[PDB]
Amino acid sequence: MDAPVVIAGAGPAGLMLAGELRLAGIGVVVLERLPARTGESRGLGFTARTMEVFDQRGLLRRFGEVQTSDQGHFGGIPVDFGLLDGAHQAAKTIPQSATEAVLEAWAGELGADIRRGHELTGVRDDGDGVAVTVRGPAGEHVLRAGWLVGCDGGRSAVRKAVGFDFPGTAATREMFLADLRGVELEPRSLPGGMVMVGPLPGGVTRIIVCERDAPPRRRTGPPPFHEVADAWKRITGIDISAAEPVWLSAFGDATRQVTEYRRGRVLLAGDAAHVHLPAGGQGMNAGIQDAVNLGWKLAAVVRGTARADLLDTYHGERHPVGVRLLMNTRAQGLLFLNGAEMQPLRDVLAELTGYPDVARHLAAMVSGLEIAYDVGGGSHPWLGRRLPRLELDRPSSTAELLRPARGLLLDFAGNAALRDRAAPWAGRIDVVTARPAAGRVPGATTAVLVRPDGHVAWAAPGTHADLPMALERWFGPAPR
Amino acid sequence: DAPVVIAGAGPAGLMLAGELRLAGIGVVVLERLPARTGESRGLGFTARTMEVFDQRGLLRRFGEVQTSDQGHFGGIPVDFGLLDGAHQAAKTIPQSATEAVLEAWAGELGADIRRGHELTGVRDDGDGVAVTVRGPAGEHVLRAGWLVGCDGGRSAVRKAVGFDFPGTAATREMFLADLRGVELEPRMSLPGGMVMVGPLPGGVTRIIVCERDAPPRRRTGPPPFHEVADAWKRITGIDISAAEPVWLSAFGDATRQVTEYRRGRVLLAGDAAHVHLPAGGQGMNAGIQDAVNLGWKLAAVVRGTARADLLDTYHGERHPVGVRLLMNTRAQGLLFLNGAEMQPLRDVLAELTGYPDVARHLAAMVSGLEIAYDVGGGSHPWLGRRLPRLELDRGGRPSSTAELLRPARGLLLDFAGNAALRDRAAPWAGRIDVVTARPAGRVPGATTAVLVRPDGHVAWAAPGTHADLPMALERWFGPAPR
Numbered sequence: 009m010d011a012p013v014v015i016a017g018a019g020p021a022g023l024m025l026a027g028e029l030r031l032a033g034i035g036v037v038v039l040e041r042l043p044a045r046t047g048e049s050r051g052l053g054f055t056a057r058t059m060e061v062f063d064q065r066g067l068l069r070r071f072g073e074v075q076t077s078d079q080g081h082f083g084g085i086p087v088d089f090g091l092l093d094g095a096h097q098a099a100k101t102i103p104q105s106a107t108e109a110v111l112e113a114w115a116g117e118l119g120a121d122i123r124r125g126h127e128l129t130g131v132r133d134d135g136d137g138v139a140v141t142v143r144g145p146a147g148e149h150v151l152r153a154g155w156l157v158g159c160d161g162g163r164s165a166v167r168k169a170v171g172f173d174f175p176g177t178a179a180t181r182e183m184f185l186a187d188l189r190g191v192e193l194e195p196r197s198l199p200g201g202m203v204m205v206g207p208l209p210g211g212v213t214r215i216i217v218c219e220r221d222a223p224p225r226r227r228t229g230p231p232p233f234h235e236v237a238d239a240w241k242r243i244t245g246i247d248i249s250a251a252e253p254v255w256l257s258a259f260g261d262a263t264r265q266v267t268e269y270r271r272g273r274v275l276l277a278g279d280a281a282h283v284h285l286p287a288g289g290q291g292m293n294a295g296i297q298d299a300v301n302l303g304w305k306l307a308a309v310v311r312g313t314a315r316a317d318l319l320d321t322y323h324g325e326r327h328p329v330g331v332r333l334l335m336n337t338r339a340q341g342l343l344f345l346n347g348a349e350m351q352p353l354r355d356v357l358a359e360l361t362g363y364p365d366v367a368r369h370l371a372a373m374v375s376g377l378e379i380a381y382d383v384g385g386g387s388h389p390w391l392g393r394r395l396p397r398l399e400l401d402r403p404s405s406t407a408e409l410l411r412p413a414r415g416l417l418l419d420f421a422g423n424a425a426l427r428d429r430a431a432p433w434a435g436r437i438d439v440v441t442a443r444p445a446a447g448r449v450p451g452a453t454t455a456v457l458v459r460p461d462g463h464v465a466w467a468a469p470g471t472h473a474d475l476p477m478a479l480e481r482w483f484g485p486a487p488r
Numbered sequence: 489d490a491p492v493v494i495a496g497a498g499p500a501g502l503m504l505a506g507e508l509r510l511a512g513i514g515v516v517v518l519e520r521l522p523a524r525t526g527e528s529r530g531l532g533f534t535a536r537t538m539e540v541f542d543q544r545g546l547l548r549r550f551g552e553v554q555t556s557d558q559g560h561f562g563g564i565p566v567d568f569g570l571l572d573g574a575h576q577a578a579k580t581i582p583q584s585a586t587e588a589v590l591e592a593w594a595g596e597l598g599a600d601i602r603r604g605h606e607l608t609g610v611r612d613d614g615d616g617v618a619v620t621v622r623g624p625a626g627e628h629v630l631r632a633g634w635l636v637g638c639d640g641g642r643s644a645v646r647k648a649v650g651f652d653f654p655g656t657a658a659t660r661e662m663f664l665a666d667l668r669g670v671e672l673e674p675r676m677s678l679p680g681g682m683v684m685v686g687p688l689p690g691g692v693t694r695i696i697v698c699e700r701d702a703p704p705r706r707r708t709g710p711p712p713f714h715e716v717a718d719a720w721k722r723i724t725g726i727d728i729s730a731a732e733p734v735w736l737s738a739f740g741d742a743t744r745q746v747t748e749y750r751r752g753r754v755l756l757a758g759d760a761a762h763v764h765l766p767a768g769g770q771g772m773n774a775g776i777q778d779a780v781n782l783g784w785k786l787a788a789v790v791r792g793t794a795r796a797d798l799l800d801t802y803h804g805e806r807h808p809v810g811v812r813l814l815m816n817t818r819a820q821g822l823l824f825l826n827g828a829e830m831q832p833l834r835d836v837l838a839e840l841t842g843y844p845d846v847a848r849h850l851a852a853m854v855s856g857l858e859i860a861y862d863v864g865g866g867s868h869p870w871l872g873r874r875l876p877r878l879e880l881d882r883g884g885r886p887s888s889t890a891e892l893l894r895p896a897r898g899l900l901l902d903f904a905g906n907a908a909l910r911d912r913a914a915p916w917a918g919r920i921d922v923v924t925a926r927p928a929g930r931v932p933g934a935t936t937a938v939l940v941r942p943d944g945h946v947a948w949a950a951p952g953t954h955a956d957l958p959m960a961l962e963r964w965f966g967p968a969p970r
């Protein structure tokens with residue numbers, strides 16, 4: 009055994025997963041094909057939920073001051089996100105290159121074995137372990153591990169070598185993205201195609217080129233600038249061929265998702281599990297959020313404290329999130345790429361987005377705060393959902409207590425009787441008697457059991473199963 | 489020869505002819521077809537269309553009409569009951585029956601309806617119109633003050649005056665088949681295309697075939713049934729080739745609208761003015777409602793009582809409505825025809841329909857109750873909008889605003905028995921009816937009086953209208969020395 013867990017890929021997903029595992033004292037080897045981070049800006053910022061999970065690991069202070077923005081929108085149609093509490097899109101200026109840099113520094117200091125320059129070329133499941141063929145700076149060797157996780161992007165080697173079913177719709181077009189230095193472009197339903205224009209920090213202009221009736225090309229592959237410039241000039245009639253390319257990329261509208269996130273001792277996360285239209289503002293957030301769901305569960309299984317059905321909750325909870333992720337990205341794409349044939353439907357929708365019922369509903373889709381797992385029956389509003397950041401009188405917060413990434417039993421009523429019911433699971437969770445003071449708290453909530461990912465598994469009152477059942481379910485068997 | 493000539497005796501033509509006859513305007517209607525073909529086409533009509541029929545006492549010519557709060561937008565079910573009076577009506581009554589009601593009503597009102605007469609040309613003589621028609625005898629020329637084109641989407645009148653007809657061309661072809669002798673279940677998202685199945689009274693089944701990637705075809709005749717059956721089987725897997733076809737037809741999704749509803753002394757109404765994807769449930773309702781807007785205004789012009797800007801309010805009011813019409817049908821059409829590539833958008837919208845704000849909005853678009861004309865400034869809720877039917881205490885007799893609007897003359901409703909404002913409307917006596925009556929209340933706020941156009945829309949109301957009553961009266965019912 010070279011490590012309990014091997015992760016292929018050091019993007020946002022793999023790096024977050026490595027951090028989540030290391031927090032739980034698990035040994036993890038990360039295989040990254042690239043010798044360094046690309047430094048691609050890609051998307052700017054991340055959703056409210058992603059900001060919340062960073063805060064749960066004390067990673068927010070590492071970005072400096074982030075700027076919130078309730079200026080959200082859906083498929084080009086402007087929507088107010090302030091109508092739903094805390095759904096504000098955030099970090100609108102923080103590029104993925106910076107987020108990757110923060111995460112890789114975080115994983116490394118935690119003891120992640122990040123081996124850059126190593127490419128996964130093969131994998132077989134021994135049933136009781138996984139054999140991983142690797143190509144590194146010396147040559148081709150073989151690592152073996154308890155579990156393999158594929159966080160190796162949309163072209164995932166792991167996915168193909170294990171034989172995951174990857175259904176969906178193929179690409180119907182090609183689009184261009186270009187960050188440009190040296191042109192004055194104004195932030196804009198013309199024929200020939202659609203175009204988006206926006207500014208970036210440091211005098212950089214970001215353009216999106218979606219020409220009408222453009223064919224989907226398999227790329228290696230950064231696009232040649234002149235090909236992007238001619239596509240642009242064909243649509244807008246503005247010559248930009250004398251600009252300076254900061255970064256160019258080509259992408260398709262292909263959307264696919266693995267039928268199962270788990271095959272034996274091999275799991276998938278991020279773009280490896282779900283691929284979709286990159287310019288939709290959800291991908292990185294989905295990969296980081298997949299990693300936070302799986303990390304503490306995979307950790308418990310390795311330690312042997314987990315119940316036999318825990319690891320399967322990764323697929324159980326995250327696959328529906330992925331389905332809804334593809335629906336969201338596909339729907340927004342239609343309102344974006346298609347020309348005037350989609351305009352009447354764009355208009356009808358634009359007439360509905362003023363109604364606060366609609367605004368809140370669309371905001372919850374994008375922010376990712378609508379995410380609600382099935383964790384059992386109960387009338388409590390938090391059950392299966394994220395625990396919102398509460399500030400506790402003890403001077404700590406729920407986000408701060410979740411930094412070690414262990415389960416929390418929060419005791420608000422100072423009840424000695426339920427603290428004794430939790431006794432067998434001592435060492436697996438922390439019992440914290442404190443007073444909520446932030447503090448959106450429903451009805452007469454006296455206690456709440458919080459999963460390491462921040463999701464509420466149980467809550468008094470309003471949960472069918474009682475505390476010992478919820479504890480056994482999410483934190484494993486304990487002789488009683 | 490004729491004060492007005494209408495080309496076409498479908499819903500738009502017949503309704504307009506009736507609206508003119510009510511005003512005493514002599515009108516000749518030209519219909520190329522010797523007899524009705526018997527196309528059921530659509531079933532039922534919208535709430536607003538029901539309301540305008542009630543305004544002329546035409547509802548009881550159908551029998552009893554059945555309302556339904558079960559609305560739909562692009563297939564997605566919507567509760568129309570959340571908006572008062574927006575219920576779909578007559579869901580069993582075919583357009584052929586509605587046409588038959590309107591023709592008898594026109595004929596009894598004195599309308600000169602000439603079937604077997606096809607319009608072939610028109611020159612606008614600056615102050616008159618010369619119409620060339622080929623009837624039973626042969627070619628002959630009619631001279632008229634006004635020619636209204638209600639001759640359908642392939643309007644000969646539109647093409648002969650040179651209206652601009654901008655829009656989008658057809659992208660596909662689709663079939664309609666009224667069949668007998670097949671047991672077919674109504675569906676509740678296939679590849680190869682989509683399909684609709686619905687029952688029709690008389691054990692007749694109605695199917696819509698929309699095969700994926702079918703090329704648009706311009707054909708004058710009906711499609712052969714073997715072509716509709718082979719498309720159907722390609723999509724569903726069910727063989728219907730042994731069916732008996734009542735009616736077969738083929739349509740495209742071309743949507744165009746004339747830039748101007750009026751060119752000199754030639755006007756357009758119905759599919760002549762705006763064509764779209766027939767699957768939306770709006771066309772006939774829009775055509776009939778165009779005819780109601782134009783009729784009384786054109787009558788005022790013929791009688792020389794109209795203000796010089798009244799006739800242009802036909803284009804002014806009905807063109808934007810026609811734009812909404814193309815948006816509505818096209819948006820809905822996308823939620824029907826496109827296969828699994830539209831499904832994510834269908835799903836999202838389906839989640840929103842449950843919100844009463846949304847349901848009410850879509851219900852207004854489809855029912856026609858959203859229609860609001862710019863008639864002037866004011867904070868009064870009814871201003872420029874349709875006057876809802878109000879039960880009234882007429883002296884000591886029960887009445888209704890619908891009943892009062894039957895003669896198709898303007899109304900000044902006095903709720904508070906005020907004879908001061910009853911003298912402000914004195915000059916326009918013989919043009920409107922001043923009615924002192926008491927409504928239920930249903931009236932918004934402290935409404936004391938309301939001026940109603942012959943088409944049912946409120947032109948002025950006290951309080952909450954910037955203009956004065958004499959100003960509003962001059963604007964809609966003509967100049968009067970004072």
Ligand SMILES: Cc1cc2nc3c(=O)[nH]c(=O)nc-3n(C[C@H](O)[C@H](O)[C@H](O)COP(=O)(O)OP(=O)(O)OC[C@H]3O[C@@H](n4cnc5c(N)ncnc54)[C@H](O)[C@@H]3O)c2cc1C
Nearest residue numbers: 017019020021041051128161278279286289290291292293
């Ligand atoms: C132009 C653009 C704009 C975007 N904007 C946004 C946005 O605003 N918001 C948002 O949430 N998302 C956005 N995204 C999507 C986001 O960038 C990706 O979804 C995110 O990177 C996915 O994380 P990942 O770790 O799973 O995949 P990856 O980032 O691709 O990480 C995969 C890593 O694994 C490595 N790898 C691949 N194969 C192997 C192998 N065989 N062996 C070893 N290593 C391997 C790769 O080198 C790579 O570094 C955008 C994407 C694009 C292209």
Ligand SMILES: Cc1cc2nc3c(=O)[nH]c(=O)nc-3n(C[C@H](O)[C@H](O)[C@H](O)COP(=O)(O)OP(=O)(O)OC[C@H]3O[C@@H](n4cnc5c(N)ncnc54)[C@H](O)[C@@H]3O)c2cc1C
Nearest residue numbers: 496498500520530607639640758759766769770771772773
């Ligand atoms: C399959 C189908 C289903 C539909 N379902 C619905 C529905 O559920 N609800 C709804 O509101 N609408 C529906 N519609 C639309 C509705 O049928 C039309 O919009 C409606 O007929 C428009 O009325 P119109 O008078 O302007 O046109 P038309 O009904 O077509 O009348 C035009 C008349 O002018 C005559 N004409 C043509 N050329 C000449 C000429 N040169 N000289 C003299 N006369 C001429 C024609 O013979 C015809 O009688 C449907 C349409 C189709 C095709």
